[PDB]
């Protein structure tokens, strides 16, 4: 039973907000996982990328705690990645899934050459950076598949990308930084300005302003 605590959840639960791109358009921080469960739900699938034991030295020996990396995606242009450390593996995974849901970003897809059909590749060459790891994504011809390492390929398939060349520099053996550098590159697709997006923006009322009267009485 979803009892929302934020005013975005109280508008999602009341059918007022009827799309995730409506929340993405205004850059509002999403703090409840039931909002993501509301819109994507049956489309979402997750993947455990690694389980990392970490240790903290104490007077009476070590202190062990386990870290979990979880990727999530709907294979249709949404992808997220979450990491969580906890004393038990089951709790770590359960808590990392929530974070992965809360990190979900949209992905922009483009065309390599001629524009027939749905977009299939990245719109342009994009680079992601994370602690000595560099990941470069290059558009690829239709039907080539994902030419990449097994770690970024999972996140690239979660995001709906079909074709892409990849390059990687730095210590990629640390998959915690290798996965956070490809996630960073995917996030940049809706940050790169192209002549497609040169039109002046029309400003629509934010949901907080549009449903003021509903929020006051609820």
């Amino acid at each position: 039973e979803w009892m929302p605590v934020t005013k975005l959840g109280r508008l999602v639960k009341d059918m007022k907000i009827k799309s995730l791109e409506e929340i993405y358009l205004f850059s509002l921080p999403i703090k409840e996982s039931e909002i993501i469960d509301f819109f994507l739900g049956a489309s979402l699938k997750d993947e455990v990328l690694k389980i990392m034991p970490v240790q903290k030295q104490t007077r009476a020996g070590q202190r062990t705690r386990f870290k979990a990396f979880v990727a999530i995606g709907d294979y249709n242009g949404h992808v997220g990645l979450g990491v969580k450390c906890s004393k038990e593996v089951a709790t770590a995974i359960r808590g990392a899934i929530i974070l992965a849901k809360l990190s979900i970003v949209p992905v922009r897809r483009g065309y390599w050459g001629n524009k027939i059909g749905k977009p299939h590749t990245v719109p342009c060459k994009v680079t992601g950076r994370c602690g000595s790891v560099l990941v470069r994504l290059i558009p690829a011809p239709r039907g080539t598949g994902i030419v990449s390492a097994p770690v970024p390929k999972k996140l690239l398939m979660m995001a709906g990308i079909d074709d892409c060349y990849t390059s990687a520099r730095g210590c990629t053996a640390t998959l915690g930084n290798f996965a956070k550098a490809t996630f960073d590159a995917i996030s940049k697709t809706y940050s790169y300005l192209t002549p497609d997006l040169w039109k002046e923006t029309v400003f629509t009322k934010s949901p907080y302003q549009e449903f003021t009267d509903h929020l006051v009485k609820t």
């Binding site: 993947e47 455990v48 389980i51 034991p53 038990e88």
Partner: peptide
């Protein structure tokens, strides 16, 4: 009612059988 991969990994992550308990836990998860 078999063995629990979670318990196996948590108890043998630093022993000789760590590489096997990781594989079994990954099989259970995915």
């Amino acid at each position: 009612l078999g063995t629990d991969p979670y318990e196996d990994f948590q108890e043998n992550w630093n022993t000789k059988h760590s590489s096997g308990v990781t594989r079994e836990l990954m099989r259970e998860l995915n």
